[PDB]
């Protein structure tokens, strides 16, 4: 199992501010294949970005993603109220087990 660590934990920034999230991989993530998920309290998680930059269909246009190798970023621009939630990074680039990142929380 190759590990994902999210550097920011329980982060709190004011609404309307740019939010940057970083997920770190112990070993290179093969041909990208990383995924960002959003989960809200008592609610099923939601796909945001798959691979590096690739945005899911019903997703707001303000969500962005990028990364290569061992370093990946989830960016939220023009922050809004519904964007308060716990965030995750998923690595499917290797053979399974697919492993989520530890999880990261964005406060008000």
């Amino acid at each position: 199992e190759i590990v994902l660590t999210q550097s920011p934990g329980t982060l709190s920034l004011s609404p309307g501010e740019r939010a940057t999230l970083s997920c770190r991989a112990s070993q290179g993530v093969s041909s990208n294949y990383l995924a960002w998920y959003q989960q809200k309290p008592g609610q099923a998680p939601r796909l945001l970005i798959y691979d590096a930059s690739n945005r899911a269909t019903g997703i707001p246009d303000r969500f962005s993603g990028s990364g290569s190798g061992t370093d990946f970023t989830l960016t939220i621009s023009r922050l809004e109220p519904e964007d308060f939630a716990v965030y995750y990074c998923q690595q499917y680039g290797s053979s399974p087990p697919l492993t989520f990142g530890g999880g990261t929380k964005v406060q008000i």
Partner: peptide, 18 residues
Amino acid sequence: GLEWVAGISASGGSAYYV
């Protein structure tokens, strides 16, 4: 945090577990 437990191939021939 959410944990991935099992993965199954579309054919079903290949199955993966944590």
